[PDB]
């Protein structure tokens with residue numbers, strides 16, 4: 228099976244995810260952050276999961292934060308809302324871009340002008356078969372319930388955010 | 394010194410870098426690929442370089458390919474052309490976005506319809522001083538320099554981005 232895949236993460240102005248934010252996304256307490264993550268692939272049995280998302284004052288995602296949004300696929304922040312996924316098909320190379328979309332309502336946890344939203348994405352299998360990967364599990368099913376995904380099958384992305392300090 | 398920084402890589406339609414390209418970028422022989430790579434940061438003394446870029450039939454950037462277009466900052470492919478960089482400054486949170494822009498001409502040397510463009514970005518220092526990073530060097534300077542240790546890392550895991558390409562083929 229073809230498990231070649233690339234991932235992307237982008238912030239958007241609204242929950243129609245029509246227009247990507249230029250240049251650095253500004254946020255304030257009780258404004259929404261709109262997050263689109265995607266995998267581009269050429270195998271229908273191949274899916275992905277948003278393993279973890281969290282914010283911190285550090286671009287390096289190895290640094291610890293207690294501002295967790297998603298953890299082990301389950302939403303940990305109470306404001307996280309999912310939108311429908313969107314699959315864009317490129318039938319000539321039989322490729323598709325599979326997009327997952329969510330938002331959260333920004334909380335005043337930190338006090339730095341710039342913050343970083345870090346999301347870790349991992350590949351999974353949509354169908355018990357010749358694809359060697361954990362089965363895709365929905366966010367709701369994660370919460371009502373933890374295998375190691377190999378480095379080429381996962382990626383962390385980090386987007387910057389600007390905040391006006393009070 | 395603040396060496397916090399995030400990177401982006403985006404493909405575009407022309408040398409104007411106006412319209413981002415769809416999720417899979419179509420290529421063909423003798424046609425252009427326009428690439429913009431950016432850093433967002435909060436230190437005027439911090440810069441970045443495009444260390445290496447190559448194309449291959451594998452999404453895994455560990456698998457090397459003989460189709461290398463930039464190596465150790467120097468353009469190895471004669472088609473590579475750099476354009477005016479853009480620098481946007483945001484005074485409220487004291488941040489800046491610096492964009493580097495380049496193009497190459499695709500050559501079709503694989504026999505797969507889906508390819509991947511891999512670029513590795515590294516941080517550098519614009520001024521000798523507090524950043525424990527190598528000095529920034531321009532692509533042309535990197536091509537002419539006989540300084541073997543100009544370029545170094547202390548990182549052991551550094552920043553790579555990969556963009557999918559479809560080779561139109563027919």
Ligand SMILES: *[C@@H]1O[C@H](CO[C@H]2O[C@@H](C)[C@@H](O)[C@@H](O)[C@@H]2O)[C@@H](O[C@@H]2O[C@H](CO)[C@@H](O[C@@H]3O[C@H](CO[C@@H]4O[C@H](CO)[C@@H](O)[C@H](O)[C@@H]4O)[C@@H](O)[C@H](O[C@@H]4O[C@H](CO)[C@@H](O)[C@H](O)[C@@H]4O)[C@@H]3O)[C@H](O)[C@H]2NC(C)=O)[C@H](O[C@@H]2O[C@@H](C)[C@@H](O)[C@@H](O)[C@@H]2O)[C@H]1NC(C)=O
Nearest residue numbers: 228229230231269450451452453502503504505506507508
């Ligand atoms: C990521 O993608 C690459 C490219 O895959 C493409 O090609 C196939 C698989 C199809 O999915 C395409 O739509 C993709 O775009 C994977 O590498 C490829 O792996 C396949 C086997 O899984 C292997 O298959 C042989 O292909 C021969 C063609 O020769 C070359 O093709 C490449 C590919 O673009 C060119 O650049 C070359 O110039 C040259 O054309 C076929 O002749 C051969 O024929 C069949 O053999 C089978 C098996 O015996 C038999 O049943 C049939 O009847 C035929 O006789 C094979 O099918 C490709 O050669 C290989 N391509 C390259 C460029 O390496 C890659 O898979 C990973 O790496 C390869 C080397 C294997 O180790 C895979 O097991 C491994 O997964 C894939 N990566 C991942 C992680 O999925």
Ligand SMILES: *[C@@H]1O[C@H](CO[C@@H]2O[C@@H](C)[C@@H](O)[C@@H](O)[C@@H]2O)[C@@H](O[C@@H]2O[C@H](CO)[C@@H](O[C@@H]3O[C@H](CO)[C@@H](O)[C@H](O)[C@@H]3O)[C@H](O)[C@H]2NC(C)=O)[C@H](O[C@@H]2O[C@@H](C)[C@@H](O)[C@@H](O)[C@@H]2O)[C@H]1NC(C)=O
Nearest residue numbers: 284285286287338339340341342394395396397435486487
């Ligand atoms: C990445 O960002 C953080 C910068 O934090 C602040 O916000 C940004 C927007 C910018 O305005 C910076 O000017 C601000 O500092 C860094 O974390 C901060 O680091 C500073 C020290 O550089 C620390 O503040 C001071 O530390 C001095 C030491 O003289 C101490 O006497 C004071 O107590 C004073 O607080 C901040 O508290 C710290 N902020 C947080 C939220 O942790 C971060 O730098 C790195 O990690 C910190 C903890 C220190 O170890 C730094 O040495 C280390 O670089 C920045 N990361 C990088 C890679 O630059």
